[PDB]
Structure formats: structure tokens, C-alpha cells
GROMACS .gro file of C-alpha atoms in nm:
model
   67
    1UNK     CA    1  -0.642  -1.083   1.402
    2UNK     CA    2  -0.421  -0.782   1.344
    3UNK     CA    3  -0.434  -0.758   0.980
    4UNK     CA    4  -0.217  -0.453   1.004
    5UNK     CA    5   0.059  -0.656   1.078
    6UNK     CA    6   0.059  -0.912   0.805
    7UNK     CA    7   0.002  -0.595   0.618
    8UNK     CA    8   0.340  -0.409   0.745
    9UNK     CA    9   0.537  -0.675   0.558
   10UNK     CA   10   0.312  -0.565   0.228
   11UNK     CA   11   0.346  -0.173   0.316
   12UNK     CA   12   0.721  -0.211   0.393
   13UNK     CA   13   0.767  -0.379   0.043
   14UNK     CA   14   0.555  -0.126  -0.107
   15UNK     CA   15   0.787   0.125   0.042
   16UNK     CA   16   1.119  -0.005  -0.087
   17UNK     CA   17   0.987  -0.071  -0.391
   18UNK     CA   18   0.758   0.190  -0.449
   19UNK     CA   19   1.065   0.440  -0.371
   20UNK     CA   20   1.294   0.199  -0.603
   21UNK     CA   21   1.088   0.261  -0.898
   22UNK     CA   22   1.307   0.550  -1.073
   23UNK     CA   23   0.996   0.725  -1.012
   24UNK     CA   24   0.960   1.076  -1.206
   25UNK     CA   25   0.540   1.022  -1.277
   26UNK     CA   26   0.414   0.660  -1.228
   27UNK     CA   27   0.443   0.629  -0.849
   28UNK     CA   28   0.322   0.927  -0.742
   29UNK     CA   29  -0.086   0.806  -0.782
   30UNK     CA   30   0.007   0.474  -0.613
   31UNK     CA   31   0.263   0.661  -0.372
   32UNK     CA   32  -0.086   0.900  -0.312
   33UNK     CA   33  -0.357   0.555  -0.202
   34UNK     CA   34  -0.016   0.449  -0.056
   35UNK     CA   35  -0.042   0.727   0.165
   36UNK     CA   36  -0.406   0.654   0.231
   37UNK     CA   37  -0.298   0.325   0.288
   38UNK     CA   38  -0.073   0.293   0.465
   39UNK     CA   39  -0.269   0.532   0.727
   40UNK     CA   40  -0.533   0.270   0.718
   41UNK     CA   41  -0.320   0.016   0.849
   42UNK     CA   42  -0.268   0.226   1.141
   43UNK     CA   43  -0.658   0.277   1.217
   44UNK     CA   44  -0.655  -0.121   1.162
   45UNK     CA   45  -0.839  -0.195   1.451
   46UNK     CA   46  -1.183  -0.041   1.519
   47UNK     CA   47  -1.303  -0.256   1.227
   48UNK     CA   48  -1.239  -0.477   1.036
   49UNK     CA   49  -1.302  -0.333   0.720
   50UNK     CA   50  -0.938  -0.431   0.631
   51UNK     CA   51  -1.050  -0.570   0.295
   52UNK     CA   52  -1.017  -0.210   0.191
   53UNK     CA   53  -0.651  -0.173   0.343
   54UNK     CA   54  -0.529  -0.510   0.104
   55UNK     CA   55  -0.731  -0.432  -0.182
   56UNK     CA   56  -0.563  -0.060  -0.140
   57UNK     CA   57  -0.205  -0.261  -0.109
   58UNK     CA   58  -0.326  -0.464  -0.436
   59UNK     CA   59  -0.400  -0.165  -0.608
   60UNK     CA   60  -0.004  -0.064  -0.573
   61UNK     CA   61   0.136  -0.444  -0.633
   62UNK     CA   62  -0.071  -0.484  -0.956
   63UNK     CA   63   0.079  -0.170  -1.119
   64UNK     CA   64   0.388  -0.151  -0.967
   65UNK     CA   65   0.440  -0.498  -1.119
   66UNK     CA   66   0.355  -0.362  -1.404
   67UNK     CA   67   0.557  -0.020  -1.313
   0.00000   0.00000   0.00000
């Protein structure tokens, strides 16, 4: 139960992506939770309140699908 690290794989591909989107005002709010994120993947651990951590990597997926 390390959530964090079925989450890397997410996080990485919101990385790539994320950066791969031309970028220039769309990425920047997702890149911003991403940043939040992502550092709740780290702190993964003294609780599992990871249902916030996905729901913050959903938050990016939905819209940079639709980015």
C-alpha cells in the first residue's frame, strides 16, 4: 500500500505531458495543483488520505485531455 508509487507512473505522465502541451496559459493552473501534487505523493505515507493525491492527478488528466 504505497499509493505513491502507482501514482509516480500518473505524475511522471503528467510531467511529460503536462510539459508537452505547447503550454503558453493552460498548464500553468494544472502545472500549479501539479506542484501540490506531486508534493503529496511524497508525504504519501503518514495517511492515507491519498484519495486527495489521485483526485489531484484527475484534476490534471481530465483537462489536459481536454488541453
Amino acid at each position: 500500500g504505497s499509493r505513491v508509487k502507482a501514482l509516480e507512473e500518473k505524475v511522471k505522465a503528467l510531467e511529460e505531458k503536462v510539459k508537452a502541451l505547447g503550454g503558453g496559459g493552460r498548464i500553468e493552473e494544472l502545472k500549479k495543483k501539479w506542484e501540490e501534487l506531486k508534493k503529496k505523493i511524497e508525504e504519501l505515507g503518514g495517511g492515507g488520505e491519498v484519495k486527495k493525491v489521485e483526485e489531484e492527478v484527475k484534476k490534471l488528466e481530465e483537462e489536459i485531455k481536454k488541453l
